[PDB]
Design a protein around this ligand. Sequence first.
Ligand SMILES: Cn1ncc2ccc(CN3C[C@@H](C(N)=O)CCC3=O)cc21
Ligand SMILES: [Zn+2]
Length: 139
Amino acid sequence: SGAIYVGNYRVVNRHLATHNDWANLVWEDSSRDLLVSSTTAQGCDTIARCDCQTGVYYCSSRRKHYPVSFSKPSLIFVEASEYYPARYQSHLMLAVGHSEPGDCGGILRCQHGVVGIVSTGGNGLVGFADVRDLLWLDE
Ligand SMILES: Cn1ncc2ccc(CN3C[C@@H](C(N)=O)CCC3=O)cc21
Ligand SMILES: [Zn+2]
């Protein structure tokens, strides 16, 4: 689990969105595994606006942060799970590192701020849903 709080927005993995997230929906995209809902309280996470390919992510299944090199956001095939059939997930970045399904929502950050959240993995590869292109999160 995990979310990003920026301004009057909350960003979460779409497959983990709650009834309240859907009742206050701003935007969702199944192909990216993202959903953004509105909040009353003001969030103060900073979103990175860059093309970094190195950063640190939080791994709840190890209670540890790990530095990684990651690919640029791209369309990657993702095997079926109980939340989606087999499909291409867009805006996804992979890195070599540990993750388990419950690790979704862990944040990946570079020196410029939040880059994305854990969304896929397996076979020693962790995948992050990018949020750097959602410029509207800052207004
Ligand atoms: C985060 N992670 N680390 C290992 C691993 C193995 C399997 C999965 C399967 N999966 C894929 C997600 C998607 N974005 O399509 C939806 C939720 C989910 O359980 C995730 C995994
Ligand atoms: Zn950066």
